[PDB]
Curated annotation (Swiss-Prot):
Exhibits self-association properties. Part of a complex composed of THSD1, PTK2/FAK1, TLN1 and VCL. Interacts with APBB1IP and NRAP. Interacts with TLN1. Interacts with CTNNB1 and this interaction is necessary for its localization to the cell-cell junctions and for its function in regulating cell surface expression of E-cadherin. Interacts with SYNM. Interacts with SORBS1. Interacts with CTNNA1. Binds to ACTN4; this interaction triggers conformational changes. Interacts with FLII. (Microbial infection) Interacts via its globular head domain with the central portion of S.flexneri IcsA (also called VirG). The gene is VCL. It comes from the Eukaryota. Metavinculin is muscle-specific. The lineage of its organism: Eukaryota, Metazoa, Chordata, Craniata, Vertebrata. Actin filament (F-actin)-binding protein involved in cell-matrix adhesion and cell-cell adhesion. Regulates cell-surface E-cadherin expression and potentiates mechanosensing by the E-cadherin complex. May also play important roles in cell morphology and locomotion. It is linked to Cardiomyopathy, dilated, 1W: A disorder characterized by ventricular dilation and impaired systolic function, resulting in congestive heart failure and arrhythmia. Patients are at risk of premature death. Exists in at least two conformations. When in the closed, 'inactive' conformation, extensive interactions between the head and tail domains prevent detectable binding to most of its ligands. It takes on an 'active' conformation after cooperative and simultaneous binding of two different ligands. This activation involves displacement of the head-tail interactions and leads to a significant accumulation of ternary complexes. The active form then binds a number of proteins that have both signaling and structural roles that are essential for cell adhesion. The N-terminal globular head (Vh) comprises of subdomains D1-D4. The C-terminal tail (Vt) binds F-actin and cross-links actin filaments into bundles. In isoform 2 (metavinculin) a 68 residue insertion in the tail domain promotes actin severing instead of bundling. An intramolecular interaction between Vh and Vt masks the F-actin-binding domain located in Vt. This is Vinculin.
């Protein structure tokens, strides 16, 4: 029942952004929603005492897989974008995500191995937790920025080229 509040808040931050749009014809939106949902599960798992070890590692694996989908798709959009200013801005963020999510897998495994066990101090334990939480905030923020910029980039899409990603806002009606 206990939940690591900053991870849950980072997850809700991403969710608030992703749910501004429909997933229909929008994978970036679908993957971002999945990440937000998985990251909320992560806050339960880090704060949960047992059985977390297998689930903590799998949750990080799921989140990293969803991030590769976000990165892969956001890179195509940058490619089809005429505005260099937006194209350049989107690409760096897309590039950073794989590094952050690779780090999520490492830190989740570290936190998972160091659990239940009384060998390590409460200091090393909290630190492992804080490293994980920091990575989670960074990841949530990077995907949120990627969602916002990918939408901004769609406006400038090369005229009549390939297939675009559909941006429909659900806030109205």
């Amino acid at each position: 029942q206990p939940v690591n509040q900053p991870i849950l808040a980072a997850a809700q931050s991403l969710h608030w952004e992703a749910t501004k749009w429909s997933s229909k014809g929008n994978d970036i939106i679908a993957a971002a929603k999945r990440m937000a949902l998985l990251m909320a599960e992560m806050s339960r798992l880090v704060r949960g005492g047992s059985g977390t070890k297998r689930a903590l590692i799998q949750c990080a694996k799921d989140i990293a897989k969803a991030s590769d989908e976000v990165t892969r798709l956001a890179k195509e959009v940058a490619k089809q974008c005429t505005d260099k200013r937006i194209r350049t801005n989107l690409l760096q963020v897309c590039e950073r995500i794989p590094t952050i999510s690779t780090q999520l897998k490492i830190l989740s495994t570290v936190k998972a191995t160091m659990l239940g066990r009384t060998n390590i101090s409460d200091e090393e334990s909290e630190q492992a937790t804080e490293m994980l939480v920091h990575n989670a905030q960074n990841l949530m923020q990077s995907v949120k920025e990627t969602v916002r910029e990918a939408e901004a980039a769609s406006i400038k899409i090369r005229t009549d080229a390939g297939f675009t990603l559909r941006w429909v806002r659900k806030t109205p009606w």
